[PDB]
Structure formats: C-alpha cells, structure tokens
Scaffold this active site. Structure first.
Site, PDB file in Angstrom:
ATOM      1  N   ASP A 150      43.892  31.710  34.168  1.00  0.00           N
ATOM      2  CA  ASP A 150      42.903  31.024  34.995  1.00  0.00           C
ATOM      3  C   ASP A 150      41.543  31.732  35.022  1.00  0.00           C
ATOM      4  OD1 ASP A 150      41.743  29.109  36.616  1.00  0.00           O
ATOM      5  OD2 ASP A 150      43.230  29.289  38.216  1.00  0.00           O
ATOM      6  N   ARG A 154      34.445  31.365  38.878  1.00  0.00           N
ATOM      7  CA  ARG A 154      34.950  31.367  40.260  1.00  0.00           C
ATOM      8  C   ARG A 154      36.012  32.453  40.519  1.00  0.00           C
ATOM      9  NH1 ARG A 154      37.072  26.955  37.732  1.00  0.00           N
ATOM     10  NH2 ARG A 154      39.302  27.147  37.238  1.00  0.00           N
ATOM     11  N   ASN A 155      36.653  32.947  39.450  1.00  0.00           N
ATOM     12  CA  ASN A 155      37.774  33.902  39.554  1.00  0.00           C
ATOM     13  C   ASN A 155      37.411  35.348  39.210  1.00  0.00           C
ATOM     14  OD1 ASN A 155      39.519  31.969  40.592  1.00  0.00           O
ATOM     15  ND2 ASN A 155      40.126  31.244  38.532  1.00  0.00           N
ATOM     16  N   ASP A 168      41.614  37.319  40.750  1.00  0.00           N
ATOM     17  CA  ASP A 168      42.564  36.198  40.771  1.00  0.00           C
ATOM     18  C   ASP A 168      43.778  36.411  39.839  1.00  0.00           C
ATOM     19  OD1 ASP A 168      42.721  32.970  39.376  1.00  0.00           O
ATOM     20  OD2 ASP A 168      43.566  33.565  41.309  1.00  0.00           O
TER      21      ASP A 168
END
Ligand SMILES: Cn1cc(-c2ccc3nnc(Sc4ccc5ncccc5c4)n3n2)cn1
Ligand SMILES: [Cl-]
Length: 294
Positions: A150, A154-155, A168
């Site tokens: 992922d 954003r991570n 993450d």
C-alpha cells in the site's frame, strides 16, 4: 465483554518481547488530544528527557493466541529500523488486553497533505528529494523481503527535519477498497503483490509528488482501471516533472514486472537527477486538479 488473563502468555515470548515493551510509568498517553484516526483505532499524542510520540490505541485483544501474534509482530517491526522508515518506539498492553502502539511523532503529518498545502512552496528539488527518501526507505524494506502493498503518498510521513518515513506497515497498518490506482497490472489481475508491484506503486507516488498530491487518473472509474491501462495508457507527465524523472516513472510501470527497476536502481537514478537541481524551479498546482476528490 470477554475476560483475558495476560499471565497466561508464553514465558519465552514475554521474555523476547521485553526490549519492545514500554513501562506503564515510562509513557503518558494524552487521551484528551486525538492526532489521527484509523479503522483499527485512534491515534493520540503521547509523552515517552521527554519526547513527543504518536500512540495508537488498538481494539481490545481477547484471544491469547492473537496476543502472541501481536507480540511477534512487534519484535519484527522493531527491527525494521531505517532513517526513511517509521521506526517503532515500542508496544504497550494494559489490563484486559488494551494494546497501545507507540510510534515517533511526525510533525508535518502525511506526505500527501503536506505537498497539497497551498502555504508550502516546494521546488522540483524538494519534491524529487522526498521521492528519493521514499526510494531509500523502500530499498531497505525490500532488503528485508518485505512487500508493502500500500505504498502511496498518504502512507508516508514527514518529521521536523523534513525526513520522509515510509509508514503504514506492521502494527501501524491501517486506512487513515483496495488501492487499485496504485496497483500494478498483474496485481489487479492475480491479486498477488511483490517488490516489483511496490515499484509500480512507487512510480504512482512519484507522480503524486510532482503534481503536489493530485488524485491519479482523476476521471477514471476505479472499477475499470485494468481496462483503462490495457487500452495502452499511463499517467501523463506532470507539468513540473523533469523528462528523466518521467522516464523513471514509465520504467516503474513496465508491463513486465521483472523489467522494472529495483529500489536500489531507483535510489541511484533518482539521486543523480536530484543532484542536478539547485532549488530554483517552483512547483505550482494544476488548475484541473484543484478540488478533485480521490
Ligand atoms: C492522512 N493520514 C495518514 C496518516 C498516517 C499514514 C501512515 C501511518 N503509519 N502509521 C501511522 S499512525 C501515526 C503516526 C505518526 C503520527 N504523527 C503525527 C500525527 C499523526 C500520526 C499518526 N500513520 N498515519 C495519518 N493521517
Ligand atoms: Cl529546483
């Protein structure tokens, strides 16, 4: 409502997890101020000299087997330590199995919201630098045979020195809906993930960086991204993306996974491109991406 007695845990397991355990007097969790929220629990500002940290309160763990797996994950994650990887400070377990995950505090939050912020004035050099840092974190993670699955802007997170931390993962894994627009062609089709599919996602992350956090494929119906790609399509070159860096993105999206560069090659290539800039090229926001939901 299930009761759990923690004294039931394996003695060898409780011994091996000691160096990751944080004492009940060593940590002060400010349940008053929430700093983040995920599906698996809230994140609070914590104090661990006194250092700021992020404390994630997980759901109460009721099975001692699942407690043991939480402890095993802690030890492995603890050893994922690198300047460009979010590096676990420790784990906490209260009476009746209320788990706390203790992470370094990231002053500038996640990388996507940071670059989207109109009060920030990144240059091409700054953004490529962030990309480079992510590649270094992923180079490390790949060397540990770990597949992220992922990877996205954003991570990744940013600290007070503007050091990017790939985050993450492990005990910090959450949504803070597979991430189909970050996924390699073969992963969309076979549901299998590898380091080479992480390299695909990394190419999309570079695109996010150079667009200052635009949603990829803005007008594409998520439930059809395989069809879209198979028409013979890739993300367009951002206006402020240097040609060699777009060439690198196209390599990250090679149709043949084995032909994609390793993260080691990516660190090398991107370090060179980065070195050519002096911070004179300001990166501005594309009018067609402003307010577009992801
Ligand atoms: C939009 N957003 C993304 C995140 C995030 C991303 C990765 C990740 N991997 N672990 C964590 S928990 C965390 C870790 C450090 C923090 N530092 C400051 C503020 C919130 C924080 C939250 N995260 N949180 C939080 N908001
Ligand atoms: Cl520049």
């Amino acid at each position: 409502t299930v009761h759990i007695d923690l004294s039931a845990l394996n003695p060898e397991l409780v011994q091996a997890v000691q160096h990751v355990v944080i004492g009940p007097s060593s940590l002060i969790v400010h349940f008053n101020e929430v700093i983040g929220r995920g599906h698996f629990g809230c994140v609070y500002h914590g104090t661990l000299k006194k250092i700021h940290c992020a404390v994630k309160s997980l759901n109460r763990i009721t099975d001692i087997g699942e407690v043991s797996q939480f402890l095993t994950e802690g030890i492995i994650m603890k050893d994922f330590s690198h300047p460009n990887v979010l590096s676990l400070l420790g784990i906490c377990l209260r009476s009746e199995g209320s788990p706390l995950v203790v992470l370094p505090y990231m002053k500038h939050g996640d990388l996507r919201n940071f670059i989207r912020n109109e009060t920030h004035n990144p240059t091409v050099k700054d953004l490529i630098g962030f990309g480079l840092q992510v590649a270094k974190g992923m180079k490390f993670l790949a060397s540990k045979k770990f597949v992220h699955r992922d990877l996205a802007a954003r991570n990744c997170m940013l600290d007070e020195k503007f050091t990017v931390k790939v985050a993450d993962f492990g005990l910090a894994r959450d949504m803070y809906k597979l991430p189909v627009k970050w996924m390699a062609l073969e992963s969309l089709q076979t549901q299998k993930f590898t380091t080479k599919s992480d390299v695909w996602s990394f190419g999309v992350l570079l695109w996010e960086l150079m667009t200052r956090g635009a949603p990829p494929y803005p007008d594409v119906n998520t439930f059809d991204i395989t069809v879209y790609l198979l028409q013979g399509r890739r993300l367009l070159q951002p206006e402020y993306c240097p040609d060699p860096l777009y060439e690198v993105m196209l390599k990250c999206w090679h149709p043949k996974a084995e032909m994609r560069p390793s993260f080691s090659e990516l660190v090398s290539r991107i370090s060179a491109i980065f070195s050519t800039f002096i911070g004179e090229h300001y990166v501005h926001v594309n009018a067609t991406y402003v307010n577009v939901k992801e």
